[PDB]
Amino acid sequence: WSWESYLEEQKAITAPVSLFQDSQAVTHNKNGFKLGMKLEGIDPQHPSMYFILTVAEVCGYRLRLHFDGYSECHDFWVNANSPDIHPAGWFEKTGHKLQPPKGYKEEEFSWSQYLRSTRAQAAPKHLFVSQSHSPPPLGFQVGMKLEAVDRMNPSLVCVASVTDVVDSRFLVHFDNWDDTYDYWCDPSSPYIHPVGWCQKQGKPLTPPQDYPDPDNFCWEKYLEETGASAVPTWAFKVRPPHSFLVNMKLEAVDRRNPALIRVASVEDVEDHRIKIHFDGWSHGYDFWIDADHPDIHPAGWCSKTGHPLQPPL
């Protein structure tokens, strides 16, 4: 099996490398993660929360992480250049809370004692793209307010806050809800808008859960009562639409079995999202994904990184 001859049979082209973000394309970095190495990282299901994690499996430029003390059914895969993982010690140095391994009490966890108990090695710091040593996005401070699309319920644009800031990214949080709706992003995110965008556009703003007398909701009043400032309007940047075209081929992670990466095709497009089709599979498995998602890659990524690629069917 090769891409070169698949494109011959199908009379097709692959999405050029240039269409991708540098982080989605890069094949030449080595994966320094080793089995059993310990580190810290966000829970993909609770993206405001930080856990002790262990390297369970490595495959090419990808790794499977295990939540120490919890079930293996919660393991999840990341790339070796993921910004959602950090070296042992990071939470303490950067003002982040640890959710400790199952059974550990509130302030009981200490890396030095845990490495002694387990006889394990912390993943070296030089592996991590994200250690909070780079300059933040200008104008996005913790506690600042904005309007944000609920990505899980995207008809809704909602009262939101910045609750976390790490390197180039910040955490968007929906006021009065839990963190299940939270998402990390940058100043060019198409899902965020300045305070007052809805009113300007003539669009319904969703106020905080259980806000008293909702929709007499007023930004002016809310900002005053919460001692909070709006993210400055100048801070938001416009992201260009992507340039993926229908029938362009590429490689994508299977969301129902994330160990695997499959031959894939652009089925449909929006300005900032693409519809993925897995070649040879029912179109009932087609799914929408953001153009900047870490789990889509140019043709050749798997071959060049050491990851097996699943052929059609």
Are the CB atoms for 8 and 286 separated by under 8 Å? no
Q: How many Å apart are CA 184 and CA 141, to the nearest integer?
A: 14
Hey, CA dihedral for 266, 190, 203, 225, is it positive or negative?
positive
Q: Are 263 and 299 in a shared domain?
A: yes
Are the CB atoms for 51 and 41 separated by under 8 Å? yes
Q: Which secondary-structure segment (H or E) carries 268?
A: strand 261-269
Q: How many Å apart are CA 76 and CA 90, to the nearest integer?
A: 20
Q: How many Å apart are CA 257 and CA 308, to the nearest integer?
A: 14
Q: How many Å apart are CA 288 and CA 293, to the nearest integer?
A: 11
Q: How many Å apart are CA 102 and CA 105, to the nearest integer?
A: 9
Q: Are 192 and 167 in a shared domain?
A: yes
Nearest to 246 by CA among 264, 212, 269: 269
Counted domains in the chain: 3
Q: Which two tokens stand for residue 27?
A: 């094949």
Q: Which residues contact 43 (CB under 8 A, 6 or more apart)?
A: 49, 50, 51, 67, 99
Q: In angstroms, what is the resolution?
A: 2.0
Which CA distances in Å does 160 have to 64, 172, 193, 298?
32, 6, 10, 34
Q: Are 255 and 158 in a shared domain?
A: no
Q: How many Å apart are CA 299 and CA 283, to the nearest integer?
A: 21
Q: How many Å apart are CA 248 and CA 267, to the nearest integer?
A: 8
Q: Are 156 and 190 in a shared domain?
A: yes
| End position of a domain, from candidates 241, 264, 287 | 241
Q: How many Å apart are CA 112 and CA 121, to the nearest integer?
A: 10
Experimental method: X-ray
Are the CB atoms for 213 and 225 separated by under 8 Å? no
What are 162's strand-pairing partners?
A: 172
Q: Are 20 and 40 in a shared domain?
A: no
| End position of a domain, from candidates 105, 132, 159 | 132
Q: Which residues contact 39 (CB under 8 A, 6 or more apart)?
A: 52, 53, 54, 55, 65, 85, 86, 87, 88, 122, 123, 128
Q: Are 120 and 106 in a shared domain?
A: yes
Q: Are 37 and 116 in a shared domain?
A: yes
Rg (CA), the chain: 21
Q: How many Å apart are CA 218 and CA 31, to the nearest integer?
A: 50
Here the contacts of 207-210 (C-beta below 8 Å, separation 24 or greater) are: 207/158, 207/159, 208/159, 208/174, 208/175, 208/176, 208/177, 209/174, 209/175, 209/176, 209/177, 210/176
Q: Are 71 and 113 in a shared domain?
A: yes
| End position of a domain, from candidates 80, 103, 132 | 132
Q: Which two tokens stand for residue 35?
A: 């089995």
Q: Are 2 and 79 in a shared domain?
A: no
Structure letter (DSSP) for residue 192: E
Q: How many Å apart are CA 135 and CA 39, to the nearest integer?
A: 23
Which CATH number covers residue 310? 2.30.30.140
Q: Are 157 and 116 in a shared domain?
A: no
Q: How many Å apart are CA 48 and CA 85, to the nearest integer?
A: 12
Q: Are 232 and 248 in a shared domain?
A: no
Phi, psi of 201 (to 5 degrees): -75, -15
Q: Are 18 and 87 in a shared domain?
A: no
Amino acid at 194: P
Structure letter (DSSP) for residue 212: S
First to last CA, the chain: 13
Range 13-33 burial, b when 16+ CB lie within 10 A, else e: ebbebebbeeebebbeeebeb
The domain containing residue 97 runs over which residues?
A: 30-132
